[PDB]
Amino acid sequence: ASKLRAVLEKLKLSRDDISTAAGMVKGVVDHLLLRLKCDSAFRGVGLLNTHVKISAPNEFDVMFKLEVPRIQLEEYSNTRAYYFVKFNPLSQFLEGEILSASKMLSKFRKIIKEEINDIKDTDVIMKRKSPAVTLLISEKISVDITLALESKSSWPASTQEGLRIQNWLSAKVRKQLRLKPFYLVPKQEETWRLSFSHIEKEILNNCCRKDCLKLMKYLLEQLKERFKDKKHLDKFSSYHVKTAFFHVCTQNPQDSQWDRKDLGLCFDNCVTYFLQCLRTEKLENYFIPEFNLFSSNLIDKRSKEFLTKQIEYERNNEFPVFD
Numbered sequence: 001a002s003k004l005r006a007v008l009e010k011l012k013l014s015r016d017d018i019s020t021a022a023g024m025v026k027g028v029v030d031h032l033l034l035r036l037k038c039d040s041a042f043r044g045v046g047l048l049n050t051h052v053k054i055s056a057p058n059e060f061d062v063m064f065k066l067e068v069p070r071i072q073l074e075e076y077s078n079t080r081a082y083y084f085v086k087f088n089p090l091s092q093f094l095e096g097e098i099l100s101a102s103k104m105l106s107k108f109r110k111i112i113k114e115e116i117n118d119i120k121d122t123d124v125i126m127k128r129k130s131p132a133v134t135l136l137i138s139e140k141i142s143v144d145i146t147l148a149l150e151s152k153s154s155w156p157a158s159t160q161e162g163l164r165i166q167n168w169l170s171a172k173v174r175k176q177l178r179l180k181p182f183y184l185v186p187k188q189e190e191t192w193r194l195s196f197s198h199i200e201k202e203i204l205n206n207c208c209r210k211d212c213l214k215l216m217k218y219l220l221e222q223l224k225e226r227f228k229d230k231k232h233l234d235k236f237s238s239y240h241v242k243t244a245f246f247h248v249c250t251q252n253p254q255d256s257q258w259d260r261k262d263l264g265l266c267f268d269n270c271v272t273y274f275l276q277c278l279r280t281e282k283l284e285n286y287f288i289p290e291f292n293l294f295s296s297n298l299i300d301k302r303s304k305e306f307l308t309k310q311i312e313y314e315r316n317n318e319f320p321v322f323d
Contacts, residue, residue, distance in 0.1 A: 001264040004215055007322045011214055014057050021141045025052055025060045028124060028137055032145070033064070035115050041090060041107065042066055048148065048183070050197050055238060056221055060143045063197060065150040065183060068099075073156065073184075080158040080290045082191040085149065085184060101131075101186035108147050109133050131186040131193075148183035148195055155182050156194065162287035163199070167253040169206065177202060196287045200242055203249075207258040212270045213245045219271075222321040223310050232306040235299045243293055244274045246286040271315055278304040278311075 029047065036042035048065040055061055074084040085099035093103040109126075112133055116124040127134040132144040155178055165174050177199055184192035204210055217238050224233045248270050252258065258266055277283040277294055281304060285291040294304060314321055 001261075003318065003322060004211075004263050004267055007215060007218065007319075008211055010322075011218060018054060018057055021058070021060070021137075022051065024122065024137050024141055025062065025143055027120065028122065028135070028143070029062050029064075029145075031118065031120060032112055032115055035111060036064070036108075039111065041092065042111075043089075044069075046150075048150075048198055050201055053197070053201075055144075058140045058142060060141065061146075062143060063146045063148050063183075063185075063195075065148050067150040067152070071149065071151050071153070071184075075156070075158070076189065076191045079191075080288050081285070082187065082193050083156070083184065084190070085192050095190065098190060099192075101190050101192055102188065104147060105131070105133070105186060112145065146185055148185045149192065150181050150183055152181045154178075158288045158290060159194075161289050162285070164250050164286075165203070168249055169203070173206070194288065199287065200239075203246070207255055208260050208263045208266050209249065209258045211263060212258070212266050213242060215267055216241045216245055216270050216274065219311065219314065219319070219321070223307070223314070226321060227306075227310070230306075232303045233310075235303050236307060240283060240293055241274065243286050244277055244283055245270055247284070248273045268315070271311060275308055275311055278308045 029052070033045060033047065036045045042064075044067045046065050046067070048063045050061070050063060053061045068085070068090065072086045074086065076082045076084060085101075086097040087094060087099065090099065093100050093107070112135070113126055116126060116135065122137065123139070124135055124137050127136065132146045135143045135145060137143060159178075159182070163174055163177060165177075180198065180202075183195045183198070185195045187193040204213075220233075220236060220238065220241050224236070227233050251273075252269070281294050281296060281301070282292060283294040285293055293299075
């Protein structure tokens with residue numbers, strides 16, 4: 001608890017340092033939006049605030065939402081996650097009715113690659129590669145730009161038994177969140193994966209819950225840094241940790257179970273469940289119950305067994321990577 005609270009301080013000591021880089025990123029993304037709106041295709045483009053999400057102190061993530069004027073979806077095979085987008089506008093990115101993910105990004109990447117040349121007293125170069133447009137602002141600040149399709153229609157069938165926040169928060173809240181829009185991002189058979197970045201931020205607003213997530217997130221960040229030379233922990237992300245955390249929040253709905261005094265216990269339980277998911281290879285998507293994020297296809301047993309060893313070692317030795 002003492003060391004965990006000392007780590008939570010180090011996180012507060014890091015966020016105020018990013019205040020500079022936040023403005024540098026915020027300045028560049030605004031430039032790109034000004035041009036994209038001029039284009040007839042990305043005319044209804046906007047920023048979905050997540051201010052911008054942080055993966056590491058020099059690693060940012062931004063998402064450009066584009067409200068497609070009414071869409072129709074077809075579930076590719078029985079993936080429950082990857083769908084086809086079909087259809088006057090956005091007719092250049094069509095393979096008949098099929099909306100091409102490749103074409104959309106190919107246009108998206110070019111337009112951005114034109115604008116980065118514009119200085120604004122700032123250096124910015126693109127890394128060609130992967131559903132995101134990666135940009136290195138100056139020489140340190142990295143930004144992964146993603147293009148998502150905002151749909152204000154009802155959520156897909158596979159979401160029906162997701163977002164189990166009835167006992168934890170309320171069923172009226174769940175309903176309210178399911179009225180908010182859902183987004184499709186690319187990932188190659190020209191199929192679009194679902195995303196709920198906005199819903200992740202929503203539950204942060206409404207204990208040591210967020211503190212447990214911060215530590216759990218930081219634990220992964222630090223383990224990835226130590227074994228960055230190795231190619232094992234590159235597959236994992238904050239989403240995997242955050243998804244696992246939400247499952248523990250469902251299992252432990254009461255506010256009494258997340259008391260400020262019981263930080264180490266609550267953190268140990270969050271660590272324990274994440275370890276269980278790696279061993280069992282079962283981390284269900286919190287929105288798509290059938291979709292397993294730790295499926296052998298996505299993440300091999302080598303990467304999970306390796307992460308299991310490190311996190312166990314850390315807990316056993318009072319988290320050496322923190323100090």
